[PDB]
Amino acid sequence: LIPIVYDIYSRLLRERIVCVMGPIDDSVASLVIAQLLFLQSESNKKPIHMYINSPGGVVTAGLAIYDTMQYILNPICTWCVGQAASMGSLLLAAGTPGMRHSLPNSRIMIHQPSGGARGQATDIEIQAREIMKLKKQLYNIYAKHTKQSLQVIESAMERDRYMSPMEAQEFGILDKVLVHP
Amino acid sequence: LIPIVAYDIYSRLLRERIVCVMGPIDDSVASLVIAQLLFLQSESNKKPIHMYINSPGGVVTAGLAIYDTMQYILNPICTWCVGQAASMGSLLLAAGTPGMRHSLPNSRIMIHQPSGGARGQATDIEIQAREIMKLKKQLYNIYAKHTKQSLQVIESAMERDRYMSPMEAQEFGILDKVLVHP
Amino acid sequence: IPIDIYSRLLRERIVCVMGPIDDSVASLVIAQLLFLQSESNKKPIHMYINSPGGVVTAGLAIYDTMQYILNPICTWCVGQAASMGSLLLAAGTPGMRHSLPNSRIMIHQPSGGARGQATDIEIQAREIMKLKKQLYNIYAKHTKQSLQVIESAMERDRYMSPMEAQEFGILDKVLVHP
Amino acid sequence: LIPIVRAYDIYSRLLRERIVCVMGPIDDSVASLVIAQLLFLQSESNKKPIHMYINSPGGVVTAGLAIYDTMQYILNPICTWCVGQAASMGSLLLAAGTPGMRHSLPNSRIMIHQPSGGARGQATDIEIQAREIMKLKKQLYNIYAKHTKQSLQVIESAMERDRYMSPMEAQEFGILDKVLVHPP
Amino acid sequence: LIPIVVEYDIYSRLLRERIVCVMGPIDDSVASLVIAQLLFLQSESNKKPIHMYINSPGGVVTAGLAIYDTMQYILNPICTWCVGQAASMGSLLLAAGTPGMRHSLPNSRIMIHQPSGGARGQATDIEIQAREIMKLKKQLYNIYAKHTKQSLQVIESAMERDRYMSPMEAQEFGILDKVLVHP
Amino acid sequence: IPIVVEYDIYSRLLRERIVCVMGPIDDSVASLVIAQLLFLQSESNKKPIHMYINSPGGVVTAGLAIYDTMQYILNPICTWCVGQAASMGSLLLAAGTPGMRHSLPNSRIMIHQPSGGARGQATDIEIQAREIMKLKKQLYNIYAKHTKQSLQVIESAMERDRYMSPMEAQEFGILDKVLVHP
Amino acid sequence: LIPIYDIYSRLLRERIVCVMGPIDDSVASLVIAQLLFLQSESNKKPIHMYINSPGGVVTAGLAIYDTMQYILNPICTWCVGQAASMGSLLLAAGTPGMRHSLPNSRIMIHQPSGGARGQATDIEIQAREIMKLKKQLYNIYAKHTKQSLQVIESAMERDRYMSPMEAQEFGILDKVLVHP
Amino acid sequence: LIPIVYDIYSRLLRERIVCVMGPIDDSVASLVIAQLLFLQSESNKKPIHMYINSPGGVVTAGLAIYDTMQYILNPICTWCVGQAASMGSLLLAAGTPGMRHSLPNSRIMIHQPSGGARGQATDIEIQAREIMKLKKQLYNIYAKHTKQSLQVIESAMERDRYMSPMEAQEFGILDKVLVHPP
Amino acid sequence: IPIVYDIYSRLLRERIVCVMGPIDDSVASLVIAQLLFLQSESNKKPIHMYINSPGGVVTAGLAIYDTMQYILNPICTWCVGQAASMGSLLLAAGTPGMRHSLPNSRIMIHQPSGGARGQATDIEIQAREIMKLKKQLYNIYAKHTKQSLQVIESAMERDRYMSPMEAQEFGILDKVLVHP
Amino acid sequence: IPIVVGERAYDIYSRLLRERIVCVMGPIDDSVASLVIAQLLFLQSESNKKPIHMYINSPGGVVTAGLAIYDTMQYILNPICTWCVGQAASMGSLLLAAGTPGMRHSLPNSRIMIHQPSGGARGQATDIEIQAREIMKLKKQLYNIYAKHTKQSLQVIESAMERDRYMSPMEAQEFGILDKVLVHP
Amino acid sequence: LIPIYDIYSRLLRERIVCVMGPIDDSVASLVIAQLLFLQSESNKKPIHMYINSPGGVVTAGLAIYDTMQYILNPICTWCVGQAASMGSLLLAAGTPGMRHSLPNSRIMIHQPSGGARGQATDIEIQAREIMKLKKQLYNIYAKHTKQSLQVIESAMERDRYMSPMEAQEFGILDKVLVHP
Ligand SMILES: [Cl-]
Ligand SMILES: [Cl-]
Ligand SMILES: [Cl-]
Ligand SMILES: [Cl-]
Ligand SMILES: [Cl-]
Ligand SMILES: [Cl-]
Ligand SMILES: [Cl-]
Ligand SMILES: [Cl-]
Ligand SMILES: [Cl-]
Ligand SMILES: [Cl-]
Ligand SMILES: [Cl-]
């Protein structure tokens, strides 16, 4: 359940490896950000490996991890394992250019954000105003790292868009579809 | 528990051309009220119909359904507020025939903007958000039509929960007479 | 439901206000009182009260109907007439408000709830005080008491015996035998 | 909870006036009653028109199609009256009325949208159920295009998302014929 | 709420017209009511035809066989009318109608599939319950092949998974006779 | 539940001297069947009684209660199996008048030993277990009486769940005729 | 579970206080305990406070606010992800010139929400204190944001979301970081 | 409770043993992949032993463990203990050719993946295409390591296919069926 | 729970594996991990297995049985309290002559139980697999008790409770020890 | 649970186990019986001659769990001193009487209860008969064990354990369950 | 809610046993285990017992009482907050002249409560036992408070709350503290 060799996630963290597993929420985001700032505080040069196997989660939690990645001076090497869907695909695409990897049988999914709203009509319009702001804010972030136009981003993320590692490499999400070290 | 006079107490009133809108208003309550308003119209298209309101409100689409049926039928409608007429219950009180909108002394009228919910993708949130804004402006135009107020007064008053006494509701234009028969 | 005993009493112009009082109970009571007024606006109406209380707006709805109809209303407290049940007992026609010897009457300020933003809570707190002032003026009107004593008595739960409620002005006669 | 007006409830009284009420969510229970009422009204007369009052937020697609088939099958002219709202399959029943007899109230609301559903099981069972919900999608689109007199391209474009319409917009689109303010 | 006529609920009013409604899922409660109606209609007249309206997603297999047996037993010609959908045992009752008297509305759909069930207990009880379910599967396949005029090899390959059909496809398969638009 | 007028569909069949044993069999169902059988005997002790069976079984004491009343009344009883007659349902099917036990072609009959529970002290377990073995032997003698089988064949066939086709139940002695047509 | 001390304690050794998730009496007690521990180390060394909170109890937020102002150390507030409700107050409560935010973060300000139950006298008592908290928060916001009381009233009447630049113009934060 | 020697699973990890026990989800997949990288960092030449006793689980979690196995340079010795079903059988076949073992009374099961889909018809078609892609993706992986044609994999995995260790060896899933170490 | 470092780990030093409580994939994985660890420490030293299990998952018990037969170490099985269902199979799987039981213990054997749900095709596959497990368990009991299959089939058709003396006569254990 | 204190931390029950003290408190199930049996075997491995102290404060529990502890108590060569604290009911009374003769003690206000075992049975009639014979064997098995250690005849045991039989420490000594009734020094 | 060596283990090092919260078999077994450990350390050093219990199981309170009276160490009972039901019995069970209580503490005594269900034979047995427990508690209270059995019967017939001075006069205490 938690092997000791020092839990198994710290021994990799000692090798400068940050694991992003399971759904992404404020708990997972705060742990990843705390590890990114600590590894930067130890060195501003050594690269940071980030293993991603997340089906998605909260949008604010994904942007919190994204900003911390795009703020630390260290180059981040993203490694997609199993799957990187929803905000997990953004963290995979937000890696250092040329250092974004994925395994052969992985799968990447992108889609527009979903949310909720309840209250008076004035409160619904305010909350719907921010959901559409996050939608276009995510579209600008994806178009920045994938080198795609906003038209292609809006057309592809209107629905759930699953991609194979080769389909994500050509789209601009990752860079290398590894088959061996 | 509904008493028997054979009918129930509400049907004995329905024979006297009396429709009771008591309690929360949803699809079930609106469907029953509309069915009664059309059955009373079939008996006579001239005899006035009396509507008693003791409703805290409910679904906006259900309240608009009753309002449309009230304005659709050519029968005169006398509205009677008992206890309280809040949310859509206040709209049904003001939707009566001009000059036939009454209220008891210790009644209470509350008006407020509609509330709702929305969940789904960002595209679905926007579609449902405007639709609530369309219902909000649709209610504000109906209130301004029967209360003879401007849209600025309706918007400023119904931004929050606006409770009114029968005198304040008469001064605002919702009801016409504050009855007192001691 | 014995064959309907409440429907039989209504034939003799008797409206029973038993159990708690909510929007459903008030709707039935108001519908019966107006039905009895449509038959005759002169014949007296008997109201049997055995209620532990309930929603305030439901009690005010019954009260306004009681004062609107021209029929004399004889109130008969049986067992207990607490909270809004005490108001309906005192709202009867003066000289026609009765209570059984071992019954009891309770009066107290209205209670409620409020939740939301600081603006909505202020609006709801405004209205719960208007109901408190409105109830005190109605109790002071029918019990022939001043607003000072009504505020001092209804600040907490105030239970009264049929003799204490008669002296306080809630009811008129404490029946021993007919 | 229904008033009693020999005695019957208010819905059974309207049924004697040849009025069927489709009010509330439409499932198999509601559809069967509506189909049973439509069959009984036809067995009383094949010429007298049938009035259908609609106040439904929608429901099961197979339930709405069941009512639609019975509406087109029976020989009686069907006057559809939208009261309150006619959303999802309720809008299809409104547009399924006799041409020229589809009415609505001025503040009513009409919504059309593509069908939804679910699928669970093996990959083979997923593909079978998925192809079925796509056949129902194309089946609804051809029915809407038939009664709204629109092209398939317009129907496919408008029903991709939830499409809310006003009585004036639903009249322009071809769902209803006239928006009534008073009895004609 | 079921509406009331005054010639009496709407299903009781149709029962006097010799119309039995098989609506919703089919279980022992629904099957027993349909059987009680069919045997009452035969006692009233063994010559007058019985009409059966079907709008069922299916249900218990034993309940569907109970209705099918009563259908084939009574001497009355049975006109089956599919409204909405006739799936699982509902498609079997639709095919169980008198030949030439099996109809369906245009936008209906018919689904057929092999039966499903459960089994739990000791290994001896599992083998008893499994053999009985397999006997029901072969029993249904023979009934379908009898009324659809198809071969067992066709029935075995079609009902292996869920097989949805349009009224035109169901007519060609042999489940119903006529697809009706206007009478 | 349908209604006739001249009355539910089961009450209308009872006027034709038909008793329906549908669904599970518990103390409630057994009491109704026995109340109808004794009522049908009070009308006529010589006219036959028809019993339609579509039951998966239930409580054994409830099945024995119906069996006792069936054998006690003087009326001949024609048992008709529709759908399935399992557990005590097969016992009521075999308890019909000899030569008047029928079944539809696709019906299914099952027989099995009784099941139950027992909880308490060791003394209570022994008493409750002894009564279950008495019910088991009491059922086996009743089955062997009406099927004309030996106790051994009844004991070995009912050790596990024994499902039979209508032809297999006719050969075993549970029913007499497998009707493909009236 | 949490990666090994632990990880938050490591950042505390670097004088970093993390205000993550909702804010209640338990979270406020931990933050105040960490702030008092960092002040016991030194009375002038800067304390860093990273915020990623959707809000929470108002009384718990005021507990953190008073502790932030009372301690002598300069507080460096960093908005990560979001800082809504009381989270924006703690973000704006930082030392002037030391209130930062990430580029894609978001700030929300709104009047306090609560509840009241009981009799009319108890409803009126609890309704007063909520109004007092509303003016108390409005005075706290107007102080650090250097805005007028009318602006704070019109802004926090409904929910108001702001980008890091919009909150910098309003007066919540001071510096908006960007691509290094 | 896990014993203490560290825990019993950590002492085996010192002997280069990775345990894939119980159902497979994202939590189990991450721990296995993390343990496989610990053994690779210690040595790229030393073989890794992976004991499997899993009924299966999430397919994406099984593909994650599969990719790490094929990625690392270390030879992997898969040992089927108890059962290797669903993705557990794929991990058993994913071992290095010639190093896939099984105990005599183990049980191997292969079957096509299962999933769910809900939403609008457009969302159903998108998710249905993905389930069919996972189906053919697993079929090509099984065909690659079992050295079978795609025709055989489709027929064998259309339903739940249970295999004895001797049958799974002939099918190509494992290599050796051991009783005692030879 | 008790420390001496649990009490079971202290026994694991003395090459003692405890199989107590219901057996599932969790218990089976722990037992196999202990058996593999004790084999790595020594291939000749015997392994003692104390059994107090009411049974459980059949595949979990088969995983323990195969691991017992795989390792080269002799395995002494000690029945304490009860050894029922798969617990009796592990008791009989010990090294011939090293299968013991306390005097007031209790041994029970029975055919496996399971479930099946789905289409008629799926029922037949799962039913065929349950019957394979039944014959597989029957061959294992006749493998260690040296009884004929006719005796194994007739005894395990129902729940067969045995005393330690009866289980020794049947061949499940070898010694009934009152004192060492 | 508190802890005490070459520098190991000991929970309060391990500190007593180091003094060769096994605590049997609360209900007795497979989990409790497994821990007690594990502790008795550990204390025997340290020394097969030093006495083992067993404190009992149990309301009872599973019969097979109590027999598992009883057999292990009789198997190990170490003399076992049983100390009844609070109450020793159901199987707890059997463990109190299972101690070495002359070393069975009890506190003044303790309470000892004995009764026949209870159980359940569900399934077919054949399964009910099998499970009924098995609880009957356990009943006779417990009666023979009580009659052995209390030195009472089997008939006295059958008459006393038909219902719940509560005893004071003085009554349990006269009956033969314990030897010494401690008297507050 | 455990401040770290935890705070209760640190007090046990000073020979202080805490009896907090309700008293059940779990609490009684811990208190008895601590009293036995503190006796093995020293038979002469006094043992301090801090009591803040609302009461609980009677057999659990009798177990602690029998352990307080069996060890040779003088027991100093210190009532804090409340000592109700069996907590008051353990308070009066201290060494004569070493029973203390804080000024605003509260002592409550009451007859035992219990349940009963089953046949009429089982009802009489369980009721005859709860009366023996009732009379047993009455003898223990009358022994340490030096009151008569008739006074204990009348006092514990209902819930009898006492102030620290009323408990001292009744015989439950010895000294009502104000300062050490
Ligand atoms: Cl970077
Ligand atoms: Cl009008
Ligand atoms: Cl009056
Ligand atoms: Cl038509
Ligand atoms: Cl026929
Ligand atoms: Cl007879
Ligand atoms: Cl500061
Ligand atoms: Cl490899
Ligand atoms: Cl071996
Ligand atoms: Cl010994
Ligand atoms: Cl002492």
Q: What is the DSSP string of G147-166?
A: --HHHHHHHHSS-EEE-HHH
Query: I107, I161 in Cβ contact below 8 A?
Result: yes
Distances (CA, A) of J136 to F127, J92, J131, J140, J142: 11, 20, 9, 6, 10
Within 8 A by CB and 6+ apart from C83, the residues are: C21, C51, C52, C53, C54, C59, C106, C107, C108
Q: Does J134 reach chain I within 8 Å, measured CB to CB?
A: yes
Within 8 A by CB and 6+ apart from F38, the residues are: F69, F73
Q: How far apart are CA K162 and CA A82, in angstroms?
A: 69
Q: Is G91 left (phi over 0), alpha (psi -120 to 50) or beta?
A: alpha
Q: How far apart are CA F174 and CA F163, in angstroms?
A: 12
| Alpha helix stretches (DSSP H) within G42-148 | 58-70, 86-92, 120-145
Strand, coil or helix: D183: coil
Query: H47, H69 in Cβ contact below 8 A?
Result: no
Reported resolution, Å = 2.8
Q: Per residue, what are the HEC states of B30-90?
A: HHHHHHHHHHHHHHCCCCCEEEEEEECCECHHHHHHHHHHHHHCCCCEEEEEEEEEECHHH
| Ligand lying closest to the C-alpha of residue J80 | 10
Q: Which two tokens stand for residue E157?
A: 């390959």
Q: Which residue in the set H81, H162, H178 is minimally distant from I129, CB to CB?
A: H162
All residues of chain A having their beta carbon less than 8 Å from the beta carbon of residue H123 are 159-160
Quick one: closest CA in D to E4, which residue?
D12
Distances (CA, A) of F71 to F81, G13, I110, K18: 18, 91, 41, 74
Q: Which two tokens stand for residue K114?
A: 């219990």
The distance from CA B19 to its chain's CA centroid, rounded to whole angstroms, is 12
- Among E88, E91, E104, E108, which one carries the catalytic annotation? E88
Q: Which residue in the set E113, E126, E137 is minimally distant from I127, CB to CB?
A: E126
Q: Does I45 reach chain J within 8 Å, measured CB to CB?
A: no
Render chain F in DSSP notation, one character per residue. --B----BHHHHHHHTTEEEEES-B-HHHHHHHHHHHHHHHHH-SSS-EEEEEEE--B-HHHHHHHHHHHHHSSS-EEEEEEEEEETHHHHHHHTSPTT-EEE-TT-EEEE---EEEEEEEHHHHHHHHHHHHHHHHHHHHHHHHHH---HHHHHHHSSS-EEE-HHHHHHHTS-SEE-S--
The amino acid at I15 = R
All residues of chain A having their beta carbon less than 8 Å from the beta carbon of residue G102 are 64, 67-68, 71
Q: How far apart are CA E3 and CA D178, in angstroms?
A: 29
Dihedral pair phi/psi, residue F25, rounded to 5° = -115, 110
Q: Does H131 reach chain D within 8 Å, measured CB to CB?
A: yes
Render chain H in DSSP notation, one character per residue. ---B--BHHHHHHHTTEEEEES-B-HHHHHHHHHHHHHHHHH-SSS-EEEEEEE--B-HHHHHHHHHHHHHSSS-EEEEEEEEEETHHHHHHHTSPTT-EEE-TT--EEE---EEEEEEEHHHHHHHHHHHHHHHHHHHHHHHHHHT--HHHHHHHHSS-EEE-HHHHHHHTS-SEE-SS--
Strand, coil or helix: C93: coil
Q: How far apart are CA D76 and CA B156, in angstroms?
A: 51
3-state helix, strand, coil in chain K (%, to 5): 45, 20, 35
Q: How far apart are CA A158 and CA G90, in angstroms?
A: 37
All residues of chain B having their beta carbon less than 8 Å from the beta carbon of residue A161 are none
Chains touching F (3+ CB pairs < 8 Å): E, J
Q: Which two tokens stand for residue E124?
A: 């001896």
Q: How far apart are CA G135 and CA G141, in angstroms?
A: 10
The distance from CA D47 to its chain's CA centroid, rounded to whole angstroms, is 21
Strand partners, C159: C106
Within 8 A by CB and 6+ apart from B61, the residues are: B27, B135, D84, D85, D109
Residue-wise burial string across H109-140, b where 16 or more C-beta atoms lie within 10 A, e elsewhere: bbbbbbbebebbbbbbbbbbebbbebbebbbe
Q: Is the dihedral of CA H23, H28, H33, H39 positive or negative?
A: negative
Q: Is the dihedral of CA J67, J68, J71, J72 positive or negative?
A: negative
For chain A, the first-to-last Cα distance in angstroms comes to 28
Render K91-128 in DSSP notation, one character per residue. HHTSPTT-EEE-TT--EEE--------SSHHHHHHHHH
Within 8 A by CB and 6+ apart from I171, the residues are: I92, I144, I145, I146, I147
Q: Is the dihedral of CA E115, E120, E123, E125 positive or negative?
A: negative
Query: D98, D78 in Cβ contact below 8 A?
Result: yes
Chains E and D touch (3+ CB pairs under 8 A): yes
- Among F55, F87, F90, F103, which one carries the catalytic annotation? F87
Inspect the interface and report whether the beta carbons of G102 and A126 lie closer than 8 Å: no
All residues of chain I having their beta carbon less than 8 Å from the beta carbon of residue E117 are 117, 120, 123
Distance, in angstroms, between I168 CA and closest chain E CA? 26
Distance, in angstroms, between J92 CA and closest chain F CA? 18
Structure letter (DSSP) for residue B97: P
Cβ count within 10 A of residue A180? 8
Q: Is C127 left (phi over 0), alpha (psi -120 to 50) or beta?
A: alpha
Q: Does H6 reach chain A within 8 Å, measured CB to CB?
A: yes
All residues of chain I having their beta carbon less than 8 Å from the beta carbon of residue J130 are 158-159, 161
Inspect the interface and report whether the beta carbons of K34 and J2 lie closer than 8 Å: yes
For chain B, the first-to-last Cα distance in angstroms comes to 30
Inspect the interface and report whether the beta carbons of A115 and B133 lie closer than 8 Å: no
Distance, in angstroms, between A163 CA and closest chain H CA? 10
Within 8 A by CB and 6+ apart from K10, the residues are: none
Q: Which two tokens stand for residue D13?
A: 């009284």
| Alpha helix stretches (DSSP H) within chain J | 12-17, 30-46, 63-75, 91-97, 125-149, 154-160, 169-175
Residue-wise burial string across D109-145, b where 16 or more C-beta atoms lie within 10 A, e elsewhere: bbbbbbbbbebebbbbbbbbbbebbbebbebbbebbb
Structure letter (DSSP) for residue J175: H
Within 8 A by CB and 6+ apart from J97, the residues are: J82, J104, J146, J149, J150, J176, J177, J178
Inspect the interface and report whether the beta carbons of H135 and D123 lie closer than 8 Å: yes
> Is B156 an annotated catalytic residue?
no
Q: Which two tokens stand for residue F151?
A: 């106790």
Inspect the interface and report whether the beta carbons of J15 and K37 lie closer than 8 Å: yes
Q: Which two tokens stand for residue B32?
A: 């029953």
Q: Which residue in the set B114, B125, B159 is minimally distant from A128, CB to CB?
A: B125
Find, among A87, D85, A127, the residue nearest to B126 by Cα. A127
Query: J95, J24 in Cβ contact below 8 A?
Result: yes
Q: Which two tokens stand for residue G3?
A: 């990666």
Distances (CA, A) of F89 to F25, F30, F63, F177: 8, 11, 8, 17
Q: Which residue in the set A5, A105, A181 is minimally distant from H66, CB to CB?
A: A105
Q: How far apart are CA K51 and CA K40, in angstroms?
A: 22
Chains touching E (3+ CB pairs < 8 Å): D, F, I
Strand partners, G101: G79, G176
Q: How far apart are CA F50 and CA G26, in angstroms?
A: 74
Q: Which residue in the set K12, K29, K129 is minimally distant from J57, CB to CB?
A: K29
For chain K, the first-to-last Cα distance in angstroms comes to 28
Distance, in angstroms, between D150 CA and closest chain H CA? 21
Q: How far apart are CA K171 and CA K92, in angstroms?
A: 8
Inspect the interface and report whether the beta carbons of H128 and D124 lie closer than 8 Å: no
All residues of chain F having their beta carbon less than 8 Å from the beta carbon of residue E66 are 54, 82-84, 104, 107
Inspect the interface and report whether the beta carbons of K129 and J57 lie closer than 8 Å: no
- Among B55, B87, B90, B107, which one carries the catalytic annotation? B87
Q: How far apart are CA F51 and CA F34, in angstroms?
A: 12
Q: Does G179 reach chain A within 8 Å, measured CB to CB?
A: yes
Query: E105, D70 in Cβ contact below 8 A?
Result: yes
What angle do the packed helices C23-39 and C56-68 form, to 10 degrees?
Answer: 10
CA of J17 to the centre of ligand 10 (A): 18
Dihedral pair phi/psi, residue J153, rounded to 5° = -70, 155
Structure letter (DSSP) for residue G79: E
All residues of chain B having their beta carbon less than 8 Å from the beta carbon of residue A127 are 125, 129
Q: After which residues is chain E broken (C to N over 2.5 A)?
A: 7
Find, among A51, A52, A63, the residue nearest to A26 by Cα. A63
Distance, in angstroms, between K146 CA and closest chain J CA? 18
Distances (CA, A) of H172 to E89, G2, H167, J21: 42, 42, 9, 58
Within 8 A by CB and 6+ apart from A46, the residues are: A16, A39, A74
Q: How far apart are CA J37 and CA F11, in angstroms?
A: 68
All residues of chain J having their beta carbon less than 8 Å from the beta carbon of residue F112 are 124
Distances (CA, A) of H149 to H144, H155, H156, H173: 9, 10, 11, 13
All residues of chain J having their beta carbon less than 8 Å from the beta carbon of residue F133 are 125, 128-129
Within 8 A by CB and 6+ apart from F72, the residues are: none
Inspect the interface and report whether the beta carbons of J132 and F114 lie closer than 8 Å: no
Side-chain half-sphere exposure of E132, counting CA atoms within 13 A:
21
- Among H49, H54, H86, H101, which one carries the catalytic annotation? H86
Q: Which of G:100-119 have CB within 8 Å of A?
A: 102-106
Query: D101, D153 in Cβ contact below 8 A?
Result: no
Inspect the interface and report whether the beta carbons of I122 and H159 lie closer than 8 Å: yes
Distance, in angstroms, between H125 CA and closest chain D CA? 6
Residue pointed to by tokens 């009866």: I166
Within 8 A by CB and 6+ apart from A6, the residues are: G4
CA of A44 to the centre of ligand 1 (A): 10
Within 8 A by CB and 6+ apart from F27, the residues are: F59, F61, F62, F65
> Is F156 an annotated catalytic residue?
no
Mutate to test the interface with A, among H67, H90, H132 (most CBs of A within 10 A): H67
Distances (CA, A) of K54 to K20, K66, K69: 9, 19, 22
- Among J58, J106, J110, J115, which one carries the catalytic annotation? J115
Structure letter (DSSP) for residue D4: B
The distance from CA K171 to its chain's CA centroid, rounded to whole angstroms, is 14
Residue pointed to by tokens 């490694």: A79
For chain C, the first-to-last Cα distance in angstroms comes to 27
Q: How far apart are CA D42 and CA E19, in angstroms?
A: 14
Query: B97, B119 in Cβ contact below 8 A?
Result: no
Chains touching I (3+ CB pairs < 8 Å): E, H, J
Dihedral pair phi/psi, residue F162, rounded to 5° = -120, 100
Query: A36, A48 in Cβ contact below 8 A?
Result: yes
